[PDB]
Structure 1
Amino acid sequence: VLYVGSKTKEGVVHDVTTVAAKTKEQVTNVGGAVVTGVTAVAQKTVEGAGSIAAATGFVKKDQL
């Protein structure tokens, strides 16, 4: 009766490897979003109306 229960991985980010030698960036930003990098987001549950989950480089401008 071994492992009668779970042995799982839910919403998992592992063994992410990155090797970026050079980024000679002249980044000019005027009222905007710029994303230059490793972004790991692991979630199990997100709920609600109008909800944003794991947004990267986002620009939200509502005339509401």
Structure 2
Amino acid sequence: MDVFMKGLSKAKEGVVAAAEKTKQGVAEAAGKTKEGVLYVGSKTKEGVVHGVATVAEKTKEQVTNVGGAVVTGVTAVAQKTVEGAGSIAAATGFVKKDQ
């Protein structure tokens, strides 16, 4: 008769903290190509390139000279998240009642 989710019922000096899916200082990288593609009876001929490509349907001579550098790729870097003092807190509570 008192059903309740993350609340606070007939109480005194109570705290509630609830952190869900809380990203704090994160480096999220997501390189995708299909995230929900749904084909029905469909004839598709896609294609993706991340870098250097030499594509064709018909050719006599294809030459590819990578004399330098081809750098690709998904990158996530979490460098110095906390330098010095200072905090990253989540879902924090207290009832400090010093006397």
TM-score normalised by L of structure 2? 0.15
Aligned length: 63
Sort the Cα spacing of 1:37 and 1:9 in 2 relative to 1 into closer, same or farther, 3 A.
same
Following TM superposition, by how much is the alpha carbon of 1:15 offset from its aligned partner in structure 2, in angstroms?
24
Q: What is the percent sequence identity of the aligned residues? A: 95
Q: Between 34-43 and 14-23, report the one with greater CA deviation.
A: 14-23
Unmatched 5+ stretches in structure 2: 1-36
Q: Which structure is larger by alpha-carbon Rg, 1 or 2?
A: 2
SS in 1 for 2:43: coil
Which deviates more from structure 2 when the two are superposed, residues 39-48 or residues 29-38? 39-48
How big is the shift at 1:38?
0.3
Pair 37,57 (structure 1): closer, same or farther in 2 beyond 3 Å? farther
Q: Deviations over 1:8-58 (max 9, x none)?
A: 999999999999999999994544221121011111089999999999999
Measure, in 2, the Cα distance between the counterparts of 1:61 and 1:27.
77
RMSD: 20.8
- CA 1:52–1:62 in structure 2 vs 1: closer, same or farther (change >3 Å)? farther
After superposing on structure 2, the runs of 4+ consecutive aligned residues of structure 1 that deviate more than 3 Å are: 1-31, 45-63
What is the distance in 2 between the residues matched to 1:47 and 1:57?
24
Higher RCO (Cα < 8 Å, 6 or more apart)? 2
Q: In 1, distance between residues paired with 2:98 and 2:60?
A: 34
